[PDB]
Write a structure and sequence with these properties.
The chain is α+β, with helices and mostly antiparallel strands. The protein has one domain: Cytochrome p450 (Orthogonal Bundle), CATH 1.10.630.10. The protein has 16 helices and twelve strands. The strands form four sheets. Strands 1-2-8-5-3 form a five-stranded mixed sheet. Strands 4-12-9 form a three-stranded antiparallel sheet. A two-stranded antiparallel sheet has the order 6-7. Strand 10 and strand 11 (about 395) form a beta hairpin. Helix 11 packs antiparallel against helix 12. The radius of gyration is 21 Å and the shape is globular. About 40% of the residues are buried. Bound molecules: protoporphyrin IX containing FE (HEM). The PDB classes it as oxidoreductase. Keywords: metal-binding, oxidoreductase. It forms a monomeric assembly.
Length: about 400
């Protein structure tokens, strides 16, 4: 029978072993989801791009056959959708309401603020020190960098960043009880509702204010929509950002020649980030669709109302596109084809430019501030996310 999906990673920092075998022998195949239903799994870069862009395929989760991967996903599909789950024309109608903050030009203008945020958190880490033992690079740095930035862009005042960063981490931490995670989730929603009310009365220079002035007050959306769009911008990317920073540090520890290159030349940070986002595809389960009508993909017929999962993680190890795909090599010559860490097509990550700027700032600065930063536990003992989840690192003891 069809194998259960998601697959488990072969080891902490490695993709599922199944993908390489499927790319070679069965690139479009059926898998079994948690509820016994079937879906198609696409593994080759060319086919992943096809799934991401076909207008015969839908992200609408109330359609029959949509591939929810967990009971929690089926429950969430009942809520009013935001743009992540919309097809044209609704998709860009709502996405355009927030895209201006994320353009290449806007993100370029944010660089001094990004640098300041990274610098301030690194100085706090230096002041705290590691004189009594290792400290957790996740809690002290990888978590607050993306958290403080997206909260600040949404509209949160500086004084509230540390508490709300903690609450949002509790929301997804593997140690939280269900009650703890749900209380934190509701706390964030309650806070954002009050902030939306505040910015309806007195807008400021932030995303929530622009939504209030330009969309809520004219009746294009309502205030509960503004809350859910802000919430989506917070939760869609934050845990992924945290994992990418931590995975970057662990990857450099595993590749000491390339770490020495980067220590000697911080201008290598953009190339490091490009290879990191290809090699550790920390969001691998988001390119999902159902077929609105029959669609042929390779040697398979995907029938109407059947579900499809396109693995950008597998695409990013596709030997036909990326030579020596399973070697981490930030000095590689890149091919014409895009790496797919941020997806592809209309739904390609709204924050791709922001995310790359955050990661570039981190990795051009971290080792200038801390030239002797070391992972404090044996690399084989790093606490990765459980193997049946997206790749990530839960905590990362360091000294410096
Ligand atoms: C390195 C960090 C990140 C990675 C690897 C990443 C990856 C992804 C991927 C794979 C998708 C799916 C794209 C598709 O459907 O083809 C996506 C979508 C999305 N991401 Fe991220 N992301 C990152 C950071 C962020 C951040 C920081 C934010 C918010 C500030 C964010 C917000 C979103 C949203 C809202 C979508 C849905 C876009 C749409 O469907 O129109 N992401 N991201």
């Amino acid at each position: 029978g069809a194998p259960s999906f998601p697959f488990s990673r072969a080891s902490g920092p490695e993709p599922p072993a199944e993908f390489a075998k499927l790319r070679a022998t069965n690139p479009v195949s059926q898998v079994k989801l948690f509820d016994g239903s079937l879906a198609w799994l696409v593994t080759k870069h060319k086919d992943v791009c096809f799934v991401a862009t076909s207008e015969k395929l839908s992200k609408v989760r109330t359609r029959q056959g949509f591939p929810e991967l967990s009971a929690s996903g089926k429950q969430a599909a009942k809520a009013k959708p935001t743009f992540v789950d919309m097809d044209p024309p609704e998709h860009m109608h709502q996405r355009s309401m927030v895209e201006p903050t994320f353009t290449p030009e806007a993100v370029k203008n944010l660089q001094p603020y990004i640098q300041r945020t990274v610098d301030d958190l690194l100085e706090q880490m230096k002041q705290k020190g590691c004189a009594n033992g290792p400290v957790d690079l996740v809690k002290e740095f990888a978590l607050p960098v993306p958290s403080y930035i997206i909260y600040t862009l949404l509209g949160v005042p500086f004084n509230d960043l540390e508490y709300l960063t903690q609450q949002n981490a509790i929301r997804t931490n593997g140690s939280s009880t269900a009650r703890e995670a749900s209380a934190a989730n509701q706390e964030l929603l309650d806070y954002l509702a009050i902030l939306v009310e505040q910015r309806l009365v007195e807008p400021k220079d932030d995303i929530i204010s622009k939504l209030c002035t330009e969309q809520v007050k004219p009746g294009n959306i309502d205030k509960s929509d503004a809350v859910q769009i802000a919430f989506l911008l917070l939760v869609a990317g934050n845990a992924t950002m945290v994992n990418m920073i931590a995975l970057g540090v662990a990857t450099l520890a595993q590749h000491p020649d390339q770490l020495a290159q980067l220590k000697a030349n911080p201008s290598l940070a953009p190339q490091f980030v490009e290879e990191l986002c290809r090699y550790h595809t920390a969001s691998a389960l988001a390119i999902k669709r159902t077929a609105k009508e029959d669609v042929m993909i390779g040697d398979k017929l995907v029938r109407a109302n059947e579900g499809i999962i396109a693995s950008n993680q597998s695409a990013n190890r596709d030997e036909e596109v990326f030579e020596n795909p399973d070697e981490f090599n930030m000095n590689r010559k890149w091919p014409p084809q895009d790496p797919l860490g941020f997806g592809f097509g209309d739904h390609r990550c709204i924050a791709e430019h922001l995310a790359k700027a955050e990661l570039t700032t981190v990795f051009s600065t971290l080792y200038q501030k801390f030239p002797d930063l070391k992972v404090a536990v044996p690399l084989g003992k790093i606490n990765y996310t459980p193997l049946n989840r997206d790749v990530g690192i839960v905590d990362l003891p360091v000294i410096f």
